[PDB]
Design a protein around this ligand. Structure first.
Ligand SMILES: [Au+]
Ligand SMILES: [Au+]
Ligand SMILES: [Au+]
Ligand SMILES: [Au+]
Ligand SMILES: [Au+]
Ligand SMILES: [Au+]
Ligand SMILES: [Au+]
Ligand SMILES: [Au+]
Ligand SMILES: [Au+]
Ligand SMILES: [Au+]
Ligand SMILES: [Au+]
Ligand SMILES: [Au+]
Ligand SMILES: [Au+]
Ligand SMILES: [Au+]
Ligand SMILES: [Au+]
Ligand SMILES: [Au+]
Ligand SMILES: [Au+]
Ligand SMILES: [Au+]
Ligand SMILES: [Au+]
Ligand SMILES: [Au+]
Ligand SMILES: [Au+]
Ligand SMILES: [Au+]
Ligand SMILES: [Au+]
Ligand SMILES: [Au+]
Ligand SMILES: [Au+]
Ligand SMILES: [Au+]
Ligand SMILES: [Au+]
Lengths: 331, 331, 331
């Protein structure tokens, strides 16, 4: 890309580009068009969620600039993706109140703190923060809803002690399950949004698009093998963590080969199992696990990589697309 | 201070001074008179809680000396403050049994282990342990009360699944809320104790006394903005975490300026929100969050500081009063 | 041992030796005969649990070799012991289904990931992973049982909010409590299995055998002092965490003397108290704490050791039997 295009830059267009890469990075895709198309998929499903994704991405990005995060970290969208999710999560789980937008901005800003926390903390081992800033901030802003009534929880939020119908697996289970598994990465209960999302990843990386598809499928059929009722599976609730596992493990943080593929398959399966685990863990307070399943399991596999000679890890500060990763190895 | 006064020292008066600085350090005040006045505020509210604060401070300090902690860490009260709290927490939440004093000594001694754990662990990033030793030890000694009946929980301890009256905000809400917010840092449901506490901090640092006041107010009105019932707010239950946030962030661990002030305001607000969050999280087992809200949120902001160019952190091994901090910067 | 015996080695006998040391290491005993005798104790109680211990040890060991863990870590059984436990835990808590063996192999394989994670993570402070890989993997594979019905929980698994009969202490309380405390380290509700286990440790280390006995007793009487009902105490449910505390602290990770003995006694008592704590913490979801009590408390004491001049820690990469440890100090 012509170095002279830098004469054309202005803080507003540069901020706008940081924001769209921010959104791309929700699925590890450092690409403006990918992020632009993620926004398109969300806006396709809901205008309200779309505006809130944008505001959350904008809130977190701006906060990072206000505090003076290193320019390259901001330019790569690493202070945007947790803000995208922080923005969608709130109106997904809670009913609208006028304060909703203020609260989204707050949740966005808070993710930026936690991203910096975790880059400082996890950086000693070269391990990425993933979506932990989004999960930890949103939990902190959501758990207290029963005591702090500004917002009112939706019907998805229902405290209960866990206990042990099953439904019927059909072709629909698989087609809906697949693409909603991708869509549910950003709380998008929408087959077409999921398709758009896969296309969006394809633009930046073909291998990462395939692993998104594989992850969703592995999560889905893991849950079926494990005798989940059909309804959650069809809704892609067992795909989205495994989607993220697939993309992270499938050539981004490890060099793609047969061994690292098997390793990736490990994360993906356990991501789906951890989804049932964390959902149960938080059920007494009625709260969603979000992407905690993907975070915990992928952190375990990431931390473990340097101990396994047969598993070629990519150095995190270098880690680009699976295609780029292979091309720098062969060099 | 005349170096010859060292000829006058004796292990008992030196231990006594370690203990009073220990108590001062509950609110980051490395000052014997501050600690002496904290004791005075507690004894003003309750003789039983006062003796137990002293015994807990004494138990933790002595254990540190028995194990051979570095003299300067002990001399600065860093092995006392968690013991002060460990001592008060037990008779605050549980009914009296003769064993109570033994258990306080045990809780005090345990905090010293955990302080050393966390200084070793968190020390790699220059992050302070705060009151995590007190919280983790007390949780470990309290959670098991339903299975181990030596002690009997008070009526504040009542397992329930969370669920969604509101009361009436008055002038009393604000005056009681303010000073009980300070008092509740040490479980002191007492307006005058809170005043005494603010005076005690003022003796060592004017800026830290103001931030104690600001923290309590920010916590209070955050909870009101968030539609908390009035009763918890009036009782200062939403101030005390934010008091600690305010003091830590307001010039002690960051150099006081407009940007670090805004940063501090961030911790304080989120400290109050995290108070609702952690209270809900532990409600199925009926247990108090203690200062976990302040610990988690302040840890996040502390870990994040080195990533933010616009936020001037003080090196922790140097960090004194906000006044001293400014005076060494200008040098 | 004659260096020429190396000519006789074959991958299958070497794997077999890795597996038996793996089992020995459940109680820190790097000894093939110790592990062989642990297997004997289990098979004495239950053939089904014995086969499953072996399969879990085999699954974790093989996975480590497949991924290329450093040979000496594997040769020392450090990638076996969490697999032993991962294997027993599943049929102890859940009813049989044909998939049980597949799931055990999965749990075994997962422990190996987490062991590597934690050796990388905790290695920066020279702190051992202990049985955290077993606990974290098994929790992840167990918690989700209410949502993923392949397996069906046994009657030990019963979600309830905690609440506040007492039974009668007799000689039986003490004899059964003692040896089941040892036996319950590996989920063996069997006095003779516990005896066998103590003998097995004695083969490798007399001091570690005594600390196993002391730990079990300290845990037992701590729980009685704390007014536990008699039934859990008799069943050794308050010994097994303290057994592990005793062995770890009694000369393995610290050089055995009077001060480190008192230190060890600290871990052991708090291990029993933490057992009530974590049992309550997980009761809303009906889940066992496993050895989390021992892990948390022993981690605290381990991390704290380098801060205490009066407490002589052994460097972890050197740490052998208490007897060997003393013999290298005197050199
Ligand atoms: Au944009
Ligand atoms: Au734009
Ligand atoms: Au743009
Ligand atoms: Au990336
Ligand atoms: Au764009
Ligand atoms: Au919106
Ligand atoms: Au919205
Ligand atoms: Au399937
Ligand atoms: Au399948
Ligand atoms: Au004193
Ligand atoms: Au004194
Ligand atoms: Au004194
Ligand atoms: Au200080
Ligand atoms: Au004093
Ligand atoms: Au007392
Ligand atoms: Au007392
Ligand atoms: Au207000
Ligand atoms: Au206000
Ligand atoms: Au063997
Ligand atoms: Au063998
Ligand atoms: Au063998
Ligand atoms: Au060992
Ligand atoms: Au053997
Ligand atoms: Au079996
Ligand atoms: Au089995
Ligand atoms: Au006893
Ligand atoms: Au006893």
């Amino acid at each position: 890309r012509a170095f002279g295009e830098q004469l054309l830059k202005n803080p507003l267009i540069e901020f706008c580009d940081s924001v769209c890469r921010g959104c791309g990075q929700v699925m590890f895709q450092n690409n403006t068009v990918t992020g632009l198309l993620f926004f398109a998929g969300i806006f396709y499903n809901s205008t309200t969620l779309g505006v809130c994704a944008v505001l959350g991405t904008a809130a977190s990005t701006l906060t990072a600039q206000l505090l003076g995060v290193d320019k390259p970290l901001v330019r790569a969208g690493l202070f945007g993706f947790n803000g995208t999710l922080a923005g969608i999560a709130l109106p997904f789980f809670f009913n609208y109140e006028p304060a909703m937008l203020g609260y989204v901005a707050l949740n966005g800003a808070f993710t930026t703190i936690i991203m910096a926390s975790l880059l400082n903390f996890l950086g000693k081992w070269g391990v990425p923060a993933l979506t932990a800033p989004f999960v930890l901030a949103t939990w902190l802003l959501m758990f207290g809803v029963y005591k702090l009534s500004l917002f009112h929880p939706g019907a998805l939020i229902a405290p209960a002690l866990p206990s042990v119908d099953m439904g019927t697996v059909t072709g629909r289970t698989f087609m809906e399950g697949l693409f909603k598994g991708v869509g549910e990465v950003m709380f998008q209960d929408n087959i077409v949004t999921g398709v758009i999302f896969v296309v969006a990843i394809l633009v930046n990386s073909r291998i990462s698009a395939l692993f998104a598809v594989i992850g969703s499928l592995v999560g889905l059929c893991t849950a079926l093998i494990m005798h989940s009722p059909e309804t959650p599976v069809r809704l892609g609730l067992y795909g989205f963590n495994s989607v993220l596992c697939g993309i992270a493990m499938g050539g981004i943080f490890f060099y793609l080969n047969i061994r690292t593929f098997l390793y990736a398959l490990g994360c993906m399966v356990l991501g789906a199992i951890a989804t049932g685990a964390f959902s149960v863990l938080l059920s007494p307070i009625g709260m969603p696990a979000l992407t905690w399943p993907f975070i915990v399991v992928t952190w375990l596999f990431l931390f473990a990589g340097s101990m396994f000679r047969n598993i070629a890890q990519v150095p995190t500060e270098k880690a680009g697309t699976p295609e780029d990763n292979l091309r720098s190895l062969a060099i």
